[PDB]
Design an enzyme around this catalytic site. Sequence first.
Site, PDB file in Angstrom:
ATOM      1  N   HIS A 111      -8.085  -4.164  -6.936  1.00  0.00           N
ATOM      2  CA  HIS A 111      -9.529  -4.163  -7.125  1.00  0.00           C
ATOM      3  C   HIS A 111     -10.256  -3.330  -6.092  1.00  0.00           C
ATOM      4  O   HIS A 111      -9.686  -2.928  -5.082  1.00  0.00           O
ATOM      5  CB  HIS A 111     -10.060  -5.594  -7.073  1.00  0.00           C
ATOM      6  CG  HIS A 111      -9.776  -6.286  -5.778  1.00  0.00           C
ATOM      7  ND1 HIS A 111     -10.439  -5.976  -4.610  1.00  0.00           N
ATOM      8  CD2 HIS A 111      -8.855  -7.223  -5.453  1.00  0.00           C
ATOM      9  CE1 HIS A 111      -9.936  -6.691  -3.621  1.00  0.00           C
ATOM     10  NE2 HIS A 111      -8.973  -7.455  -4.105  1.00  0.00           N
ATOM     11  N   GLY A 148     -14.498  -4.975  -1.039  1.00  0.00           N
ATOM     12  CA  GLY A 148     -15.322  -6.169  -0.975  1.00  0.00           C
ATOM     13  C   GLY A 148     -15.957  -6.282   0.399  1.00  0.00           C
ATOM     14  O   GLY A 148     -15.679  -5.466   1.275  1.00  0.00           O
ATOM     15  N   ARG A 168     -13.066 -11.024  -7.934  1.00  0.00           N
ATOM     16  CA  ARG A 168     -13.066  -9.595  -7.666  1.00  0.00           C
ATOM     17  C   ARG A 168     -12.104  -8.816  -8.575  1.00  0.00           C
ATOM     18  O   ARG A 168     -12.375  -7.668  -8.918  1.00  0.00           O
ATOM     19  CB  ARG A 168     -12.770  -9.314  -6.181  1.00  0.00           C
ATOM     20  CG  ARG A 168     -11.477  -9.889  -5.595  1.00  0.00           C
ATOM     21  CD  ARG A 168     -11.479  -9.626  -4.086  1.00  0.00           C
ATOM     22  NE  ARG A 168     -10.255 -10.003  -3.372  1.00  0.00           N
ATOM     23  CZ  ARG A 168      -9.925 -11.244  -3.024  1.00  0.00           C
ATOM     24  NH1 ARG A 168     -10.714 -12.269  -3.329  1.00  0.00           N
ATOM     25  NH2 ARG A 168      -8.818 -11.459  -2.325  1.00  0.00           N
ATOM     26  N   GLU A 185      -3.905 -12.748  -4.952  1.00  0.00           N
ATOM     27  CA  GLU A 185      -3.424 -12.047  -3.769  1.00  0.00           C
ATOM     28  C   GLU A 185      -2.560 -12.996  -2.940  1.00  0.00           C
ATOM     29  O   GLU A 185      -2.692 -14.217  -3.044  1.00  0.00           O
ATOM     30  CB  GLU A 185      -4.608 -11.559  -2.925  1.00  0.00           C
ATOM     31  CG  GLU A 185      -4.204 -10.893  -1.612  1.00  0.00           C
ATOM     32  CD  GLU A 185      -3.341  -9.654  -1.820  1.00  0.00           C
ATOM     33  OE1 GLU A 185      -2.289  -9.763  -2.480  1.00  0.00           O
ATOM     34  OE2 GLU A 185      -3.713  -8.570  -1.323  1.00  0.00           O
ATOM     35  N   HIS A 199      -1.223 -15.414  -0.266  1.00  0.00           N
ATOM     36  CA  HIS A 199      -1.955 -16.403   0.524  1.00  0.00           C
ATOM     37  C   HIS A 199      -1.711 -16.195   2.027  1.00  0.00           C
ATOM     38  O   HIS A 199      -0.611 -16.450   2.519  1.00  0.00           O
ATOM     39  CB  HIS A 199      -1.510 -17.812   0.119  1.00  0.00           C
ATOM     40  CG  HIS A 199      -2.479 -18.890   0.497  1.00  0.00           C
ATOM     41  ND1 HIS A 199      -3.119 -18.922   1.717  1.00  0.00           N
ATOM     42  CD2 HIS A 199      -2.907 -19.981  -0.181  1.00  0.00           C
ATOM     43  CE1 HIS A 199      -3.902 -19.986   1.773  1.00  0.00           C
ATOM     44  NE2 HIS A 199      -3.791 -20.645   0.634  1.00  0.00           N
ATOM     45  N   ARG A 257      -8.441  -8.154  11.382  1.00  0.00           N
ATOM     46  CA  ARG A 257      -7.178  -7.445  11.564  1.00  0.00           C
ATOM     47  C   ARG A 257      -7.094  -6.640  12.860  1.00  0.00           C
ATOM     48  O   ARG A 257      -6.102  -6.721  13.584  1.00  0.00           O
ATOM     49  CB  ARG A 257      -6.912  -6.505  10.379  1.00  0.00           C
ATOM     50  CG  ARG A 257      -6.862  -7.169   9.007  1.00  0.00           C
ATOM     51  CD  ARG A 257      -6.364  -6.177   7.944  1.00  0.00           C
ATOM     52  NE  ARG A 257      -6.368  -6.746   6.599  1.00  0.00           N
ATOM     53  CZ  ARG A 257      -7.456  -6.890   5.846  1.00  0.00           C
ATOM     54  NH1 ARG A 257      -8.644  -6.503   6.297  1.00  0.00           N
ATOM     55  NH2 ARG A 257      -7.358  -7.431   4.641  1.00  0.00           N
ATOM     56  N   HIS A 291      -4.140  -7.479  -6.888  1.00  0.00           N
ATOM     57  CA  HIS A 291      -4.492  -7.257  -5.490  1.00  0.00           C
ATOM     58  C   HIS A 291      -3.457  -6.439  -4.725  1.00  0.00           C
ATOM     59  O   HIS A 291      -2.407  -6.086  -5.259  1.00  0.00           O
ATOM     60  CB  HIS A 291      -4.696  -8.611  -4.816  1.00  0.00           C
ATOM     61  CG  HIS A 291      -5.620  -9.519  -5.568  1.00  0.00           C
ATOM     62  ND1 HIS A 291      -6.959  -9.643  -5.260  1.00  0.00           N
ATOM     63  CD2 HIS A 291      -5.404 -10.327  -6.633  1.00  0.00           C
ATOM     64  CE1 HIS A 291      -7.526 -10.488  -6.102  1.00  0.00           C
ATOM     65  NE2 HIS A 291      -6.605 -10.917  -6.946  1.00  0.00           N
ATOM     66  N   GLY A 292      -3.765  -6.147  -3.465  1.00  0.00           N
ATOM     67  CA  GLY A 292      -2.874  -5.354  -2.636  1.00  0.00           C
ATOM     68  C   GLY A 292      -1.437  -5.837  -2.543  1.00  0.00           C
ATOM     69  O   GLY A 292      -0.511  -5.089  -2.852  1.00  0.00           O
TER      70      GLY A 292
END
Lengths: 253, 253
Positions: free
Chosen positions: A10, A13, A61, A88, A90, A99, A187-188
Amino acid sequence: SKYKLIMLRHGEGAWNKENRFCSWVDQKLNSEGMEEARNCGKQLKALNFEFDLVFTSVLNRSIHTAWLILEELGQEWVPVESSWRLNERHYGALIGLNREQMALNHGEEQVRLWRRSYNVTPPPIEESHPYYQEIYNDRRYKVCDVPLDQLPRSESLKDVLERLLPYWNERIAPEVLRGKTILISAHGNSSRALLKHLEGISDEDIINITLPTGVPILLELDENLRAVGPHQFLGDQEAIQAAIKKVEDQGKV
Amino acid sequence: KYKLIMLRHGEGAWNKENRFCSWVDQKLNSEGMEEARNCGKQLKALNFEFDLVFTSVLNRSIHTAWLILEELGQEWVPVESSWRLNERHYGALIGLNREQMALNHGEEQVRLWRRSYNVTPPPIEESHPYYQEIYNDRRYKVCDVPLDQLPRSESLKDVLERLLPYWNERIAPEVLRGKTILISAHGNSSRALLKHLEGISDEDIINITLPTGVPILLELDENLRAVGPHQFLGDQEAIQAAIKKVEDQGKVK
């Protein structure tokens, strides 16, 4: 190849921008992410893609990304199916953390391992975590194919594939074999998980695969649903490699 | 006793132009999008928690549904779209100005074309300005009925005949299972369902006009028959005025 499918991560965000692990937190796309979704739809339209079915996670998303893609294609009528098994990975206790700050405090290599390792399982999120409530109290998790108490509290990439593979095997793969053109808005890391399976990527090599946001990923499969050549990002390879580098750089400093 | 919500999507460009839209796949305009969000806010106020959403394959009913789910934070709720919920097919009248028709054929005749149960609009011909885009769209090449068998015009009676099977077979069973359903449809397809559920006579249905973007509350008994007449959610004066606006589109100045 005998079959072709499209999967993607996606668009950007709020947390994707503040550089905070989002994971199961239901954060919405921001204006930039919406546009990424729209550009994806335009790229797919330019390539004549006509989807017959779309699969998403239950995180809004990924759903809004699919909706924006379908609108650009003028295919809003195409059936959509959503499942937590596409959610995605967890991040457990790491959810909400910055990060770059973790990289500074623990070391770039340490964060890189947490983010891309196939086997390392993040520390489970606890009821005392700032985002535990806004996750496990949502109704979407009361109607999953497993009880709320059985849902993960953290997952390694290996755990993700373990709960995603069943969905691919039982719901998605059958459709692909039927000749249907499928779009997977995920997701990634959940996307990295499926690619590992389809392309037969080793536990070691999967570490080096980072996916850019809002970029169509074309997968060509054979009769056994096994990839025939590495995944292909649809678009300008230079701009796509910079987007990938952008994701990698989130853990640098 | 069971309750469900059905509504007519918001305004489109042809609304202010006063032109029959019907099967032309026109998008919502800014005002129509807002109408959908307002419906979502009202439903959220009532703490609605939908389990399933049914729409037509005309994108304006789908976008309306998506906007409502976004307002509710329920984007993960399953959505199903069918041509059987499509607005009544106005045949050759598609694209024509309602007031012009009143001046040309008289208010009485226009009223019959718009609200009668048995009067059939003249069928749309291949030469019609909007024929191509309608029957060339892939969404009608994958319906449960061949593209060549799709209607070229429909009386309200025709609508009920193709809509009723969908209600009985795919929606009503969910109602009997205690599920909370949202039906995002159109003016006449909604009137057709209301006629059936409330047992309105062929004669009385002519006086029923539904306002755009207004939640319609309907309660059904164990036999899936209306416990009482449908109710409109919101400011009653503004609603009656909106209804008058729709009625006046078919009258001479």
